[PDB]
Every structure is written in structure tokens, then in C-alpha cells.
Amino acid sequence: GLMQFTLPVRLCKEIELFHFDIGPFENMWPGIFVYMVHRSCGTSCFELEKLCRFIMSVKKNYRRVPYHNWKHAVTVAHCMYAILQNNHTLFTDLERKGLLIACLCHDLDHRGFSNSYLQKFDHPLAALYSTSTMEQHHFSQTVSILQLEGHNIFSTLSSSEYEQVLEIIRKAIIATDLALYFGNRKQLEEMYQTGSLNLNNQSHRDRVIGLMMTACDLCSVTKLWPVTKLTANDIYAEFWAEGDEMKKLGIQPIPMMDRDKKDEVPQGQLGFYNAVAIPCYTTLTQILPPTEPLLKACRDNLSQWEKVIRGEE
Numbered sequence: 442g443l444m445q446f447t448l449p450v451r452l453c454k455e456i457e458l459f460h461f462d463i464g465p466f467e468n469m470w471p472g473i474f475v476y477m478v479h480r481s482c483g484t485s486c487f488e489l490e491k492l493c494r495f496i497m498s499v500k501k502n503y504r505r506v507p508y509h510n511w512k513h514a515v516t517v518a519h520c521m522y523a524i525l526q527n528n529h530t531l532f533t534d535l536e537r538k539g540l541l542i543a544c545l546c547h548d549l550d551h552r553g554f555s556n557s558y559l560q561k562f563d564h565p566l567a568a569l570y571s572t573s574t575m576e577q578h579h580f581s582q583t584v585s586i587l588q589l590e591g592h593n594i595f596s597t598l599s600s601s602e603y604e605q606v607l608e609i610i611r612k613a614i615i616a617t618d619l620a621l622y623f624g625n626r627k628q629l630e631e632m633y634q635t636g637s638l639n640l641n642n643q644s645h646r647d648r649v650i651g652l653m654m655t656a657c658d659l660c661s662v663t664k665l666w667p668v669t670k671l672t673a674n675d676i677y678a679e680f681w682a683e684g685d686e687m688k689k690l691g692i693q694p695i696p697m698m699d700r701d702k703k704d705e706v707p708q709g710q711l712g713f714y715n716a717v718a719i720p721c722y723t724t725l726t727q728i729l730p731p732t733e734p735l736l737k738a739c740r741d742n743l744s745q746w747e748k749v750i751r752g753e754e
């Protein structure tokens with residue numbers, strides 16, 4: 442009960458900032474997640490024995506892929522932690538519990554391939570889940586791990602609170618399907634602008650939590666330029682592997698995914714910042730003003746990609 446996780450001074454201070462990098466020491470990442478749960482939720486939210494067993498089973502079920510790996514899971518959970526801490530009174534006890542777990546689990550058992558590649562391959566998962574293919578798999582994997590003996594971190598919730606938190610986690614993980622982000626944000630934009638946005642309306646909260654999930658999932662674009670630039674290499678390593686597998690199916694990949702067309706990456710990054718990232722953090726900043734630093738950091742990185750294109754780096 443009286444056992445707190447503490448971090449070294451530099452981490453204890455920087456972990457509170459949106460642009461925190463969790464570092465190259467993998468063995469510190471579980472401790473960083475428990476620290477965030479304890480400050481975001483309470484030291485009582487989870488039995489520490491069960492939480493530690495849950496974390497380590499989640500870690501084991503992430504693969505050794507360049508980007509969609511255990512470091513991504515903890516990075517996305519940290520961004521959610523920073524949003525929740527800067528918006529203290531907007532979220533319920535159940536939501537703070539559910540969303541940190543949702544972020545840690547959101548890419549469980551990812552193979553480094555898009556929903557599109559699974560469908561063109563004719564992967565069994567594409568027959569089981571016709572849309573949000575990987576995301577329905579990630580939620581399925583989450584439920585499987587929660588049902589391992591000694592892994593049910595929610596066991597002390599009432600029956601209805603248990604059902605509520607599993608439903609928060611399901612919607613949160615489905616929302617990480619970028620195909621669903623475009624319509625979700627358009628609707629949030631209209632609701633904000635016509636002044637109909639109402640956070641006591643459950644359908645409205647769902648939408649806002651979905652946008653938070655997109656914002657945390659993309660948070661690699663909100664780091665200091667050296668982190669953003671080095672993470673983009675990991676992202677493109679999966680894209681080019683997927684491109685290679687498209688060529689093996691006799692399909693020319695989009696140029697972004699073709700490792701023979703690396704010169705076109707910086708222009709591809711600009712489209713992504715302008716079509717996805719900037720609009721995502723703009724709507725997020727409008728709805729939750731204290732998340733402005735994510736939008737500012739994203740604009741700074743857009744400007745760094747413009748310099749890469751102009752040949753200034």
C-alpha cells in the first residue's frame with residue numbers, strides 16, 4: 442500500500458512534459474508506466490502484484506518490429522498521461538484507469554503491416570474482422586491477457602463498472618484505426634464550431650476520447666526534432682518492408698512505401714502533417730486548451746521537414 446515508484450530527478454520532472462522521451466533503457470519502461478498510473482489514477486487503482494503481471498504479459502505480446510513495438514505502447518501511454526494530468530477534472534476515475542491501459546494495449550501483437558496489406562494478402566484476420574482489422578485484433582488480445590489467471594487488474598470493480606471500463610477500452614482501441622479519424626475529427630470540428638459540443642453527452646465524450654487516442658498514437662510528431670527524425674526512420678522501415686511485400690504479391694506499392702523512392706519521403710511527411718497531424722492537434726487544442734503544446738511541437742516539426750525538403754538538412 443505504502444510502496445511508491447520514484448524516478449531519478451531529471452525523469453521525475455520531464456515525464457510531466459508532453460515531449461518526454463522514455464529513453465533507451467527498456468527495463469525502466471514498466472516502472473515509468475506504473476509511476477504514471479499511480480499519479481494519474483491513485484496508488485489504490487490496481488493491485489501492484491496484478492498490474493506488474495499484466496504489464497509483463499502485454500510486453501511479451503508486442504513483437505520485435507521497428508516501430509509498432511513495446512516502446513511505442515509506453516510512448517502512447519505517456520502522451521495520454523500528459524493529457525490527463527493537464528485536464529485533471531474533465532475525466533472520471535474509470536476513464537483515467539481505462540485510457541492508460543487502452544494506450545498500453547492499443548497495438549498488441551502488431552506485425553508491422555497495415556489493414557490494407559492484410560486484406561491484399563487475404564490474411565485470416567481480414568476474414569474475421571472486415572474493418573479496423575488489426576484494431577479488433579488488439580482489443581481481442583487485450584481481453585485474452587485480462588482473462589489469464591492473476592492478470593485481472595479490474596477484478597475489484599463492480600459488474601457495471603467492469604463493463605463500462607471494457608467498453609471505454611474497446612472504443613479507445615478501435616479509434617486508433619486512422620481510417621476512422623478523418624470522419625471523427627470533421628464531426629468534432631462541426632460540433633465545436635456550431636457550439637453543440639457537450640461533454641455530458643456520452644456519444645460526444647466517445648468522440649473526444651477517440652481524438653485523444655489519435656493524438657497519443659501520433660505523438661512521435663510532437664517530440665523534439667531529433668526524436669521525431671529518428672522515430673520516422675523506424676516508421677519508414679515498416680513502410681518499406683510492407684512495400685516489399687506488396688511487390689511480392691505483384692502490386693506496385695504507393696511511392697511513400699517503395700524503398701526505391703526514399704527521395705519522396707519529406708514531401709510525404711508534409712502531406713501527413715498537413716492532412717492528419719496539424720488538423721488532429723488543432724481540433725484537440727480547441728476542445729482541450731491545455732494540450733496546446735502538442736500543436737506547437739507539431740508545427741515546429743512541420744517546419745523542420747520543410748527545411749529537409751529545401752535541402753537545409
Ligand SMILES: CN1Cc2c([nH]c3c(Cl)ccc(O)c23)C1=O
Pocket residue numbers: 619658659660661662673676697709710713
Ligand atoms: C507518426 N506517423 C505515422 C505516419 C507518419 N507518416 C505517415 C504517412 Cl506519410 C502515411 C501514413 C501514416 O499512417 C503515417 C508518421 O510520422
Ligand SMILES: [Mg+2]
Pocket residue numbers: 547548575617618
Ligand atoms: Mg495501431
Ligand SMILES: [Zn+2]
Pocket residue numbers: 513517547548617658
Ligand atoms: Zn499505435
